Amino acid sequence: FASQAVAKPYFVFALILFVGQILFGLIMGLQYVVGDFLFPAIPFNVARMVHTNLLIVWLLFGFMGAAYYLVPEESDCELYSPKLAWILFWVFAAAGVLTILGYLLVPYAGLARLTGNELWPTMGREFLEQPTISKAGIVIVALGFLFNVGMTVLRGRKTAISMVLMTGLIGLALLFLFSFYNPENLTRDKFYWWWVVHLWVEGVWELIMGAILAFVLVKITGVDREVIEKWLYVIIAMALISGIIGTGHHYFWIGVPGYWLWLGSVFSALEPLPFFAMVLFAFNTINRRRRDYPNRAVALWAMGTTVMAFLGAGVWGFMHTLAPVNYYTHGTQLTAAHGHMAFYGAYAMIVMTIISYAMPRLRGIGEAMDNRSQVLEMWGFWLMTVAMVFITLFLSAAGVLQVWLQRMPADGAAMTFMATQDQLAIFYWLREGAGVVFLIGLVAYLLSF
Amino acid sequence: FTKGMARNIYFGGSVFFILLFLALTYHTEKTLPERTNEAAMSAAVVRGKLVWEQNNCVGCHTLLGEGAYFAPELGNVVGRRGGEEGFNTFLQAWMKIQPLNVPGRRAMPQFHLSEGQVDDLAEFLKWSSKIDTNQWPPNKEG
């Protein structure tokens, strides 16, 4: 199928933006330990919002591209609108780029003023720092996309893969609506904030990744459609079942009733399950091949992604999801550690899993690259992957050291924020190091093209 | 055990839990005016919240333990800076003296805030600090 041609820009643009994310992560990582680095010009809070908004946005481009590609194979027909796919690309790229720039080129508050935040306040919330106009831009682009791709599954086959990925996307769009809801009451604010972040990341995205993964197994393997989709259904079932009440894990210390400590810890315990079964899925349907597949780089990506998703979201999430542990660890380098591996492990990795699949057969090259461009990919796989397990280790080491020095002693013996921060330097230095390894590993993954 | 019985577990399994969650969030919202002490949520504090969002403090600090890990928890900062009585006065000073300029220290920008805006910020923080937070953070340091 031809009009899968549209999926390229989205990937390519996504790769660029993700280079951006790293440099800014690298700035922050330096600012930790050289605390005035690039101050006043680029304060920590600006670098962060660039780092974290480039993450969200690039992953979206990945997702979309992914949809634009696999849907038409699944749907058995050409995509509804290539022109809408191309137009949207530019709107959404223009919007991402313009808003990152606002962050850099104007002090946040003046940017508030400038975009008339005054009218309908939505800025200044973690991951929701974009002006109310950029949010709406993001919304419009999303709705057009659902239309373009959703229209493609009304006419045409309905696989379970497409159905499930479609549910995936629609939910992502709808929940993103709560970003326009900014309650005057602080605890009510945080309460609904989590309906975006967590309902995204432990619920509705899981559908998007599962479906993306299920697709790649099907094609990469030959294994029967009926078992993959049966499995695909099992995994989301466990995701939704554990994840919806699970949002309780974010509900311990914010103002909402105590019963959340119980509900949240109980259901949270179950949340690694989808991810484990995701590793089972991975190995077992890429255990029993109807054919050896030219690209063993997709295989790897597919396994790695499930494995990493499980260590990061699965294992690291459990470590600190029970209330009595969370009580001390909440809002700590342990939080940074989990956030990193899990986002990398599930969502970064899956985006590249598909890229490795779609890309060759998109520049019309073939089902894989020349062995030169294959061993590069695998090197880039291993540098980035290893680097991240390193990044999270140093971060955990620093988290645990923070909890010991600041959280556990009583008043008077607990060390101040800024002073325990200084003891942690060595870890942050090593963290920068792993961060450098990563960039190099991205650059390799890139030069595989 | 086939794909159908798998798919329904998903359908109903998630309809049950969505409604259950919507129920509890209904229940939660009716305790909030007691827990967060909305009776004491003044024009001052709602405005303070605005000042907070518009300057992106959460881009560096944590509030009630969510936010950024660069800089201290402000959720309980009242307690650790002369508390109820003199906090407003402190925060007035705190904001005009940034950045401190100790070499190599992490720095806080100068926001050029009005004495009105700072005074709002203070009530917002003072009020934030009295939310029933299930006894979090563990201690004075936050």
Partner: antibody, heavy 124, light 108 residues
Framework: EVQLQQSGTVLARPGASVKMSCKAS????????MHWVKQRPGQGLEWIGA????????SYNQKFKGKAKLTAVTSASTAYMELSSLTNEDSAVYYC?????????????????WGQGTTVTVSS | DIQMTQSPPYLAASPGETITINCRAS??????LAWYQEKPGKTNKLLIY???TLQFGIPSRFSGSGSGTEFTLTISSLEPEDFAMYYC?????????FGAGTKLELKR
């Protein structure tokens, strides 16, 4: 309230040794440099040195590298200074004080609270 | 080592008047000068650090200014309790060093 409480007057003979203390209360002892300052009558303040009770490191003014030894005991929130081989030039008031900012890398900052001073008189 | 000399050694003034005192450094210390007040039977008290930043709690009647090498503290409308000894402290370099002080006496 941040307070430093210093020990009473000590009297020594020349060549002898003396150990005075500074008891910190009202803040996180382990998070600030504790500094020590010397003052003799009509004679201007001199920075002796500092200890950081969070990791026990010290820093001495090169002029007091023989004279003085700073240590700290974290469970009692107290810091100590031992002066040695007392000379008549060591009769003076000695202050402890607390760096006005917390952390290990603010080594050379100004102070925000002082002890009241402990007198040392050296005489035969 | 960098050496501080304050001037004048002593100064007489009356309540309600303005006085201003000087602190010079042997070499550049950028902005990092602090001032303390000493009174009999009280602990030394930080007034200004970083050349011009008022410490928490100190009334604004006090102020200071300078960089590099030459610094001043000013009191705006002297008050009865302002008659005290004032010391300056450089906080740019190890070792910390102090001026020998200025005595601000009450005229009669």
């Amino acid at each position: 309230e941040v307070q430093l409480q210093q020990s009473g007057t000590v009297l020594a003979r020349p060549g002898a040794s003396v150990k005075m203390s500074c008891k910190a209360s009202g803040y996180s002892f382990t998070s600030y440099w504790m500094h020590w300052v010397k003052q003799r009558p009509g004679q201007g303040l001199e920075w002796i040195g500092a200890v950081y009770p969070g990791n026990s490191d010290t820093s001495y003014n090169q002029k007091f590298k023989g004279k003085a030894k700073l240590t700290a005991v974290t469970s009692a929130s107290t810091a100590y200074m031992e002066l040695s081989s007392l000379t008549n030039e060591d009769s003076a008031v000695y202050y402890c004080s607390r760096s006005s900012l917390d952390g290990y890398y603010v080594k050379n900052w100004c102070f925000d609270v002082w002890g009241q001073g402990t007198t040392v008189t050296v005489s035969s | 080592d960098i050496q501080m000399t304050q001037s004048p050694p002593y100064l007489a003034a009356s309540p309600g008047e303005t006085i201003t005192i000087n602190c010079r450094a042997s070499k550049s210390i950028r902005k990092y000068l602090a001032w303390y007040q000493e009174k009999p039977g009280k602990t030394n008290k930080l007034l200004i650090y970083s050349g011009s930043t008022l410490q928490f709690g100190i009334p604004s009647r006090f102020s200071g200014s300078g960089s590099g090498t030459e610094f001043t503290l000013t009191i705006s409308s002297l008050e009865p309790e302002d008659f005290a000894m004032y010391y300056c402290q450089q906080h740019n370099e190890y070792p910390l060093t102090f001026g020998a002080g200025t005595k601000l006496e009450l005229k009669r």
